[PDB]
Amino acid sequence: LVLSQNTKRESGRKVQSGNINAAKTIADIIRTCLGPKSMMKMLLDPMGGIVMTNDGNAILREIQVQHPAAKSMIEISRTQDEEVGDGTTSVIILAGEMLSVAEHFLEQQMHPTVVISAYRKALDDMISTLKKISIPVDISDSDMMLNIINSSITTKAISRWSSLACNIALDAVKMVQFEENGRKEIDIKKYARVEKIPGGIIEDSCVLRGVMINKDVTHPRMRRYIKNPRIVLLDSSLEYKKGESQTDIEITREEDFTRILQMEEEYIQQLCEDIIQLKPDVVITEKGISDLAQHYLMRANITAIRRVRKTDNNRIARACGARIVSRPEELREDDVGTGAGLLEIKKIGDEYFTFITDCKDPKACTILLRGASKEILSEVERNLQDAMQVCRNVLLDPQLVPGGGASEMAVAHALTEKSKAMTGVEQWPYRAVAQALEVIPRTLIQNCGASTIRLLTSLRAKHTQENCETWGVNGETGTLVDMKELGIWEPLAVKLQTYKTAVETAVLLLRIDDIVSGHKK
Amino acid sequence: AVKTLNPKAEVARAQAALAVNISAARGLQDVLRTNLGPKGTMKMLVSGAGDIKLTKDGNVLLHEMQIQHPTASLIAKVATAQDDITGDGTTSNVLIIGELLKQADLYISEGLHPRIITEGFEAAKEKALQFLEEVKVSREMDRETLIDVARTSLRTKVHAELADVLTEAVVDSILAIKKQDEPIDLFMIEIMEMKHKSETDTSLIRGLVLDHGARHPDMKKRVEDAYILTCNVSLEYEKTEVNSGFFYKSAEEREKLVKAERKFIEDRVKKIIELKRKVCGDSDKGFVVINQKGIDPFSLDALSKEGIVALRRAKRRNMERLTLACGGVALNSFDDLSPDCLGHAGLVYEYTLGEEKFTFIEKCNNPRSVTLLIKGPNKHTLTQIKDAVRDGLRAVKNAIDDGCVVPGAGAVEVAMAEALIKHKPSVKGRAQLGVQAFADALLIIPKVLAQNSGFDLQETLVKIQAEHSESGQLVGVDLNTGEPMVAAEVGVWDNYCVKKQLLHSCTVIATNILLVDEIMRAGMS
Amino acid sequence: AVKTLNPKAEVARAQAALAVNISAARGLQDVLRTNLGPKGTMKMLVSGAGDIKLTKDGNVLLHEMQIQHPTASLIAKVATAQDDITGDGTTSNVLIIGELLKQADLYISEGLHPRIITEGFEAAKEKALQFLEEVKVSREMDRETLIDVARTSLRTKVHAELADVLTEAVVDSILAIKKQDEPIDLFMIEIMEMKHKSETDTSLIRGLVLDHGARHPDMKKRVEDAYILTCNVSLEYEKTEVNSGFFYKSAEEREKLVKAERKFIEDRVKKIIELKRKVCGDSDKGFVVINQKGIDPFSLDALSKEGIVALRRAKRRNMERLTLACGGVALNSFDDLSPDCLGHAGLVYEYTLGEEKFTFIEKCNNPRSVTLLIKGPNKHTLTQIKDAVRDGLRAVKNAIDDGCVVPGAGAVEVAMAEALIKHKPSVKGRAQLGVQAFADALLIIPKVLAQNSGFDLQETLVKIQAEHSESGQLVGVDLNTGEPMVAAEVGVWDNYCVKKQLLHSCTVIATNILLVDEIMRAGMS
């Protein structure tokens, strides 16, 4: 017994093949999942539930593996999925075939490292190529976004609900720009809360100018409906709290026990009049509520809600623009809930809901999802999740690309122009990537169900012409289609990270030459 | 394939998993098709704990029939919404679902791609809903119209006599509910049950009942005229939050501190004691107190000496009901105490059953909250009658909500069917098959009826498949002769949203179900 | 129920087992449907013993695809019968079966009681067979007629080239087979296979080939002119059937006992050699012998010194072919020996392959027994083609057997369909339903043909669903363009009885299949 006592090892071509095989496996289980003609997959969770989604990431997110590079690929998915949302509908699939041809030079006894070098060389050419054939666009023009929005969602089941979602997405993003960074304001996808409520229909689901609380009034008398509410966000609890420093009390005369009892009551009263002093209408706390305080707030005609998640609270704060407070005596009129167009508490059916909309200039809001069932709606928001995602990315970059394989062919021959201009051993790797690129539209045809070879060849033959760069494939016809009229248009950074991530996998995987298990630590 | 990735993993394939789900749902629907319909039969479920059902609302059944097939559980969830939305026709949804896929399979088994048929449904939902939209008969809030739909709903659930008995109760409950703008179905509604003497005698009470009684003998059981204290602040003893253990030197002082401790609560009752004696200077009227928390024994002594009814530990929603019935001003701080804060009822007493106690509140001037008192011979029946009670109430809530009402007995469906069949391939043609298939699925509801009702399916369909003339009427199927019948005249009805929601929901369900390929099972060990 | 009678027993129920069985065939047909049609794919099987298949004829698949579902095993049996009846279309037969049951299910799924539909089938087949009887094309035994039919059949299994090579041999055999009245296909058909040099070079031999060779090196490998000895009596030693203990007293007698023992066989061989020498006084002529039993080496030597070809241990049927080959008079008693009892061949040599020995019979003036020597590159393929061969022959034997012929490729089924769809409810009405599906089920053959050919189904059926005019033709589906085709003009044909029996076979299968309710299993331990 020598090395590690039941830790296996592997080396060389067997290893490299294993990764390639493991890689090749990873893509194909998803190769059907992309396109306007894509499939939609349903999954078995560990814990009993059901998830159905076309977004590959979640599918891969729910995948348990033993092969390491496979686990590597999994993480690769969520990173870009975190990064851009969609294209993971293609991201990994692009990687594996890149590898799939990549192995084709290994038996050529070609050291991968140099094959890596071309891969590096390839990327910059791709990056430069794409920028050349990128398309700047205005951001204020809403309808273009929606087409861009629709284009980005014309792969998911919300295709039939494109118009709403496109509006649904567009409005939500448009109202998110934290301008306190000068002219470098940032939107955030952590305030655009998504709320799934059962019943109703897609059409019933709509964007609400503010936030929703799945709670109910602590006391009946408080109005469930107010025109112009005034709001206080009380981070602190509204009731007596123990003296933190383990204080203790020894009374000697009779009255003190009752007296100290009144004193905490007074302390309660003490807090309230400070609140009523600012003429609020609304009491909000992430904590519980003294009913005795609640009594006086009821006396105050001031509505109170307790025990709310902080995340929503700040959004509530962001909704009416007011700022949260934990110090009632230090309450500031600058944090009044001014800018709440309406307070209401509705009934969805067995649940009270808090309506606070029509803010003057809401920066935060939550979307109310009304559909078929949460898992249906869970799919919906995932389509939303990306749907909002690319939009903000667009608000980062006004540059657009015709995806759908059109840019891809554009890249390919551009490299082919390079490859024949790039004599040397690395040339064959270089043209390999170009040829490797071609599979994504090929998938489309398989997803479409047409003559892939004939279509692609005509496609490639079409794009040998320098005059035309927007020739792509319609998803449903499976015919050569220039993109300008078809309108499937894509943000630059999306495909950027796509290629950007794609290569990083290979080189990372290409260096792999040995296996070691059993760390036991 | 992915077996390469994992050995313990499990995956299906396109034809395979597809075949699974249809069989799953078709298998699912077969079980439940025995249910819906007044001639239908409720089913009895047995817990592994030995508990028992007698229901027909499959939502309970599905929720309680343990299945492992995911799509079925998938079906369970959306239905769980639907019952949370309306309650019945949940039955229809699933039967709608499976037979939809059944016809869908007929075509995909013919090689026809699901996306095409899905799109065939896509329009198919559209045209019907418009037809659904236009055809709803706008009806105003006539009590009897409320009555019959309520009767329509209940006969699916309970005895024709029993339904009729309850049919009166709910609508009278319902009528006493609306503030002409906003019903909530929650507080105005109390569902209370006693294992007592009948199923039929189960009767709505003009007031509210409480699930408990006094905790002292001298409390008078009956109160002729009730003057009401609603409250929630504890009249039990309590000690401050802070470490406050005290000391003494004299047992005489020990008694004094005993006195001091009680005094704060002693003060509390006295205000009530005075205000009571202040308000009820008359001997005749009676005064009662309500606490959602507990009541101290010494406090019990206090009120007993003044004969003031108090109850402790009530459900937090009860006081709302106490308000909406007796107009009592629910309060916490008894210091700011007014006679104006009171509630008044025409009668309050306790009814003792077996070991438990119940407290009766009666004759509010303008009660807005009542109780659906359930008398019970059997526990399961109480539960069994209970959901149908829930089943009816929401329907009436749906009924009042919508100014229209749908003829029941599937009269809608043929109208859609002839309407949908009254669509040339204005569709892209290959889609019309799914449209042709889609309408075919719609006729299932009447089919299961006569299938439940014994009459032969096709011939009954054909005969009822009769728009008569230019007056191709809204025809329900006779529920005892299996004959064409006009539901409107016979007054068999249903809510527009009901029909509205179910198709929409079902449509969404189906397309996705047909739009899955393989079912993967690879999770952590 | 009877679970009461037995705990370990298992029972199904009317609804239950019905679905199970139809589910069973529906799966079964799904796998096999890939095969029939020239574009179809043969399948490869691996034994648990590791053996290998490359087959397409389903009976082989069914017989070797280890399944337990009973109905399939039942269906397997008739398919095997059909294999014992005609050989292919068993393919179609099962595809007919489950698909009928599938269409059958559609109506009972509408609650229709199956008994009615059976009668519809009963009427339906009758009209169909009535049409089937009239529509068969009376055709002579034109070489080309059968040739196309052979090519029609043989393409179902192998390369277009391979069958074309095969086509010539079988038909000429068929031509060289009949005594103008009655074929039996057993003697005159010798199917021998060698792992030799190709698949294609498998050929008819005008003579015969043997599975073994001479047992002596001096034995002549090749002989110009062969005079044939057909026999079965052992020329190995034998000792008589009675216990016959002998002794001797001298070792001289021991040798004298040596010679005596041999003397009997000595005469036996002596009778032949004199006959040979009475026959083959010429040096040029060569003399060959065939025994069904074994031969003594000393006897071998006896022939060896005379340079006599002889063979031992032949299968009991080979001599018939030999008599059907050389006109030789197969005998047992050599005392009654006549030159007229001999057989004559124009050429014989032996072919040595691998370790085995193969022997060659050539140049009968009018051979009446021939051989399908199968040249093979690979063992499975030899087995593979052989099934295709035996199938191909049995096609022809019926083809000659029936002076009529059916144009193939399912042109009949549409013709069946249109005529059957052209049936008013001259039936009692309710049966017209089952007839409708019965007719409906018939179109599967081209459907899968287009399916196996990849062309879209629904449109093509409609296309070919165009009887043109008064000459509403027997129109086939093109097997490579999916287009209307005159099978007769293109010479695509089939055996009438094939079409005859399969309908009958399937129908009887169907009705009983639909006419079971529960599947019992209560057997001893």
Q: Which of B403, B426, B448 is the last residue of a domain?
A: B403
In a domain, C37, yes or no: yes
Determined by cryo-EM
DSSP class of residue A329 equals G
Whether residue B291 contacts residue B309, with contact meaning beta carbons closer than 8 Å, is answered with no
Last residue of a domain, which of C313, C340, C367?
Answer: C367
Closest CA to A229 of A351, A137, A320, A364: A320
SS3 C90: helix
Does B456 contact chain C (CB < 8 Å)? yes
Q: Is A56:A30 a contact under the CB 8 Å cutoff?
A: yes
- Least Cα distance to A161 among A448, A432, A10, A372 occurs for A372
Q: Domain check: are C27 and C156 in the same one?
A: no
Across the beta sheet with A303-305, what order do the strands follow? A231-234, A282-285, A303-305
Q: Assess whether B284 carries a catalytic annotation.
A: no
Beta carbons of A221 and B330 less than 8 Å apart: yes
List of residues 6+ apart from A45 with CB closer than 8 A: A51, A62, B523
- B174 domain residue, yes or no: yes
B103: distance to nearest CA of chain C, Å? 10
Determine if residue A95 is left, alpha or beta; phi over 0 gives left, psi from -120 to 50 gives alpha, anything else beta: alpha
**Angle, to 10 degrees, between the axis of helix B90-108 and the axis of helix B70-85?**
140
Identify whether residues C194 and C265 lie together within a single domain.
no
- C5 located within any domain: no
How many whole angstroms separate alpha carbon B475 and alpha carbon B495?
A: 17
Instruction: Kindly give, in sequence order, each residue whose CB lies less than 8 Å from that of residue A268, ignoring residues fewer than 6 positions away.
Output: A239, A240, A290, A292, A293, A296
Q: Please compute, for residue C339, the number of CA atoms within 13 A of its CA located in the half-sphere on the CB side.
A: 9
Contact between residue C315 and residue C290 where contact means Cβ atoms under 8 Å apart: no
C104 falls within a domain: yes
Nearest CA in chain A to B240: A261
Alpha carbons within 13 angstroms on the beta-carbon side of residue B502 total 23
Whether B32 is in a domain gets the answer yes
Sole residue written with tokens 């279309």: C89
C263 and C318 together in one domain:
yes
Q: A361 catalytic, yes or no?
A: no
Tell me: do C219 and C190 sit in the same domain: no
What's the distance, CA A299 to chain centroid? 45
What are residue A196's DSSP bridge partners? A369
C111–B457 C-beta distance less than 8 A: yes
**Sign of the four-CA dihedral A408, A413, A416, A418:** negative
Same domain, B514 and B451: yes
- CB count within 10 Å of CB A242 equals 11
Q: Which residues pair with C205 in a beta bridge?
A: C371
Residue A399, H or E segment: strand A399-401
* CA Rg value for chain A: 29
Q: Are residues C223 and C301 in the same domain?
A: yes
Which residue, among B463, B329, B352, B474, has the nearest Cα to B408 in the 3D structure?
Answer: B474
| CB atoms closer than 10 angstroms to residue C34 | 17
The C residues from 424 to 453 touching B (CB cutoff 8 Å) are: 433, 451
Residues tagged in the binding site annotation of B for ADP:
37, 89-92, 156-157, 409, 494
* Domain range enclosing C350: 207-367
- As to burial, measured by CB atoms within 10 angstroms (0-12 exposed, 13-18 middle, 19+ buried), residue C257 is middle
For residue A174, what are its two tokens? 């448009």
Least CB–CB distance from B451: residue in C30, C111, C451:
C111
A124 catalytic? Reply is no
| Distance from C-alpha of A512 to C-alpha of A501, rounded to nearest angstrom | 17
For the beta sheet containing C404-407, the strands, ordered from the edge strand earlier in sequence to the opposite edge, are C137-138, C404-407, C493-494
Touching B (3+ Cβ pairs <8 A), the chains are A, C
C110 interfacial to chain B (CB closer than 8 Å): yes
Which positions of C are catalytic? 57, 90-91, 391
Taking CB atoms and an 8 Å limit, are B110 and C457 in contact across chains? yes
| Chains interfacing with A (3 or more CB pairs < 8 Å) | B
Determine whether the annotation assigns residue C91 to a binding site: yes
Q: Are residues B347 and B213 in the same domain?
A: yes
Neighbours of B435 (CB within 10 A): 25
- Indicate if C219 and C93 belong to the same structural domain: no
Q: How far apart are the first and last CA of chain A?
A: 19
What CATH number is associated with residue C421? 1.10.560.10
> Do the Cβ atoms of C276 and C287 come closer than 8 Å?
yes
* Chain B: residue whose CA lies nearest to C16: B27
Across the interface, whether the CB atoms of C110 and B456 are under 8 A apart is answered no
Q: Is residue B5 domain-resident? A: no
C112 contacts chain B (CB < 8 A): yes
Q: C404: helix, coil or strand?
A: strand
* Bridge partners for C190 per DSSP: C371
Choosing from B71, B91, B371, B381, the catalytic residue is B91
Minimal Cβ distance to A254: which of B74, B256, B394: B256
Q: CB neighbours of C372 closer than 8 A, spacing ≥ 6?
A: C169, C170, C173, C189, C190, C191, C192, C202, C204, C389
Q: Is B34 on the interface with C (CB under 8 A)?
A: no
DSSP-derived 3-state class of residue C494: strand
- H or E segment to which residue C89 belongs: none
- Of C317, C341, C367, the last residue of a domain is C367
Resolution (A): 6.2
Tokens of A94: 């692009």
Classify each residue of B222-261 as buried b or exposed e, where b means 16 or more C-beta atoms within 10 Å of its C-beta.
ebebbbbbbbbbbbbeeeeeeebebeeeeeebeeebeebb
- Count of beta carbons in the 10 Å neighbourhood of residue C183: 16
Closest to B513 measured CA to CA, from A30, A449, A379: A379
Instruction: State the pairing for strand pair A480-482/A471-473.
Output: antiparallel
Nearest residue to C261 (alpha-carbon basis) of C274, C248, C277? C248
Q: Is A360 annotated as a binding residue?
A: no
Exposed (0-12), middle (13-18) or buried (19+): which is C442, by Cβ within 10 Å?
Answer: buried
Of B99, B142, A116, A433, nearest to C110 by C-alpha is: B99
Tokens of B233: 């602040």
- As a whole number of angstroms, the distance between CA B201 and CA B100 comes to 43
Binding-site positions of B read: 37, 88-92, 156-157, 409-410, 494, 499
Tell me, yes or no, whether B113 and B179 share the same domain. Answer: no
Say which amino acid occupies B420: L
CB A436 within 8 A of CB A419: no
Residue A509 CA to residue A513 CA, distance in Å, equals 9
Alpha-helical regions (H) of A227-369: 255-277, 291-299, 310-319
C106/chain B closest Cα distance in angstroms: 9
Structure tokens at C6: 């037995």
Is residue B152 one of the residues assigned to a domain? yes
Q: What domain count does chain B have?
A: 3
Q: How far apart are CA B199 and CA B378, in angstroms?
A: 8
Collect all residues with Cβ–Cβ distance below 8 Å to C240 and sequence separation of at least 6: none
Whether residues C280 and C197 share a domain: the answer is no
C454 touches chain B (CB under 8 A): no
Please indicate, yes or no, whether residues B146 and B122 belong to a single structural domain of this protein.
no
H or E element that contains C56: none
- Find the catalytic residue in A53, A285, A386, A498: A386
Mention every residue, 6+ apart, whose C-beta is less than 8 A from residue A212: A193, A195, A353, A354, A355, A356, A366, A368
- Same structural domain, C199 and C341: no
- Determine the residue of chain B that is closest to A45 in CA distance: B523
The CATH number of the domain holding residue C399 is: 3.30.260.10
Collect all residues with Cβ–Cβ distance below 8 Å to A365 and sequence separation of at least 6: A172, A175, A191, A192, A193, A207, A208, A209, A210, A211, A319
User: Active-site residue among B57, B83, B148, B296?
Assistant: B57
Q: How far apart are CA B284 and CA B28, in angstroms?
A: 64
Place of tokens 């204080």: A247
Q: CA A404, CA A89: separation in Å to the nearest integer?
A: 12
Closest to B18 (Cα-Cα) out of B121, B118, B114: B114
Q: Which of C148, C162, C26, C208 is nearest to C489 (CA)?
A: C148
Between the CA of residue C23 and those of B234, C60, C97, C101, C469, what are the distances in Å?
Answer: 67, 22, 12, 9, 41
The SS3 call for residue B412 is helix
Pair of tokens at residue B481: 């002769």
Between CA C362 and CA B214 the distance in angstroms is 119
Contact A362, A211 (CB under 8 A): no
Instruction: Determine, yes or no, domain membership for B6.
Output: no
Dihedral Cα C335, C336, C341, C342, nearest 10 deg: 10
